[PDB]
Amino acid sequence: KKIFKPEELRQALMPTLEALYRQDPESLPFRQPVDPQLLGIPDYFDIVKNPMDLSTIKRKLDTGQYQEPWQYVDDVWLMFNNAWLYNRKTSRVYKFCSKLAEVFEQEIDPVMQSL
Ligand SMILES: C[C@@H]1CC(=O)Nc2cccc(C(=O)NCc3ccccc3)c2N1
List the domain boundaries for the chain: 1-115
Radius of gyration of the chain (CA): 14
> Which of 96, 76, 86 has its CA nearest to residue 24?
96
Per the rule left: phi > 0, alpha: psi between -120 and 50, beta: everything else, 107 is alpha
Cα separations in angstroms, 48 against 19, 24, 85: 25, 24, 8
Asked, as a colleague might, if the bond just before 25 is cis with ω within 30 of 0, I would say: yes
Q: Closest residue (by CA) to atom 21 of ligand 1?
A: 29
Give me the resolution in angstroms, 1 decimal: 1.0
Three-state secondary structure call for residue 84: helix
DSSP 8-state code for residue 106: H
82 near 48, Cβ under 8 Å? yes
Q: Which residues contact ligand 1 via a Cβ below 6 A? A: 28-29, 34, 39, 41, 83, 86-87, 92-93
Cα-to-centroid distance, 87 and ligand 1 (Å) = 9
Four-way CATH pick for 1-115: 2.60.120.260, 3.40.50.620, 1.20.920.10, 3.90.198.10: 1.20.920.10
Report the run of H or E that residue 52 belongs to, with start and end: none
Asked, as a colleague might, if the bond just before 36 is cis with ω within 30 of 0, I would say: no
State the structure-solving technique. X-ray
